[PDB]
Amino acid sequence: IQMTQSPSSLSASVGDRVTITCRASQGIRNYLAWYQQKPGKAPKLLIYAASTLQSGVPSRFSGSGSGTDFTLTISSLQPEDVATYYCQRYNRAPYTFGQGTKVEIKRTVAAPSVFIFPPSDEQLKSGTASVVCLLNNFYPREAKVQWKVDNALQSGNSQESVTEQDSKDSTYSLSSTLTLSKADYEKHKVYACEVTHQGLSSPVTKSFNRG
Amino acid sequence: EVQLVESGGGLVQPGRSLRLSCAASGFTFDDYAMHWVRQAPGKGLEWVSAITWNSGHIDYADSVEGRFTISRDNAKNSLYLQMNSLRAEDTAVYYCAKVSYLSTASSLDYWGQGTLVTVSSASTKGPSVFPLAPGTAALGCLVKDYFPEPVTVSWNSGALTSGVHTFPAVLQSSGLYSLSSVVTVPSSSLGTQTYICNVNHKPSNTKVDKKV
Predict the structure, then answer these.
(1) In terms of DSSP bridges, do strands A83-89 and A101-105 run parallel, antiparallel, or are they unpaired?
(2) What CATH number is attached to the domain comprising A203?
(3) Which residues of chain A make contact with B172, given a CB cutoff of 8 A?
(4) Torsion angles phi and psi, residue B116, rounded to 5
(5) For labeling, which of A53, A192, B136, B199 is most exposed (least CB within 10 Å)?
């Protein structure tokens, strides 16, 4: 008993017709369901009996199939439809799920807003420095953050984190953290994050003074 | 208001056991089959176990078999999962789900918010929380060096929703996690309205209102 879906991932534009397939390894008649999971939340039931809609579910989600081959169609992709969709066999044990299909959204390119944060004095007391750079409400995901300390490129000492894709305006957000000890942090004046992004004809650079 | 509230998750050591509970209300529990599904982090949904309305038939995912024991108390209107001989990749968010119709041959039509289970021989460590201070301005809190997940973060006792971004946690070299939550607010405020990040990390039983 396997359930397989394709694609594993897809981008598409608001208005587009999206298609997701699900292949059961053995005839399941119409005991197939479709679930959406938004990031952060618990899964909702969209379609059951291969093609029956759950109540209160918008019509633009449509399901077809019988036997082994099944299909979820979303026929007018809206920004709130960003999630991962799962098929599930339920005719019999095992009640197994497909691998999932992440669906990401449009959209026109948008520039980040860049902010810089020094480490609080309550933290240098603690013994270590954290410097934080924030990129806000951009698209697409791709972004380069180069840290610079006394104009020195910095390498091997940042971690990064991306929020999932906003349901409303289809954007991402990034925080970068530069960590280094009180030793090095006291040794320099200019800390800076160079931000490089498709929505920015030239890179933007935020910076502060003290140390 | 249909409800399924899981509980019982947390840190547990390799080899040990955990009992997950799930309290049911809204519908008539005594009448439905129930399921346990789980999700590792960033990974996909995996079905675990099912049991019929009268405990008459049980099914387990080869993947547990002889380690997990689903059960229920129709009087207490509650569902259980006894998980034993745990291993790092039993680590996951575990959901209970209700079945839509009568029959086990029916879809799952409602799922709890779930409980995180983390399988690890590392001790809990509470976070230290640091302020990140600066048209529009941005501020936030740095929630550093805690274990295990989750922490949650609101601003101004939930009063402040627009402009909040809480970033997924990153595991550090040290073996602990780090978080950062942020907000965007008018540059005009600042010196007028006050901003407070409210961090809560249960596993360590600490709250901090850091006050930026």
Answers:
(1) antiparallel
(2) 2.60.40.10
(3) 159
(4) -80, 135
(5) B136
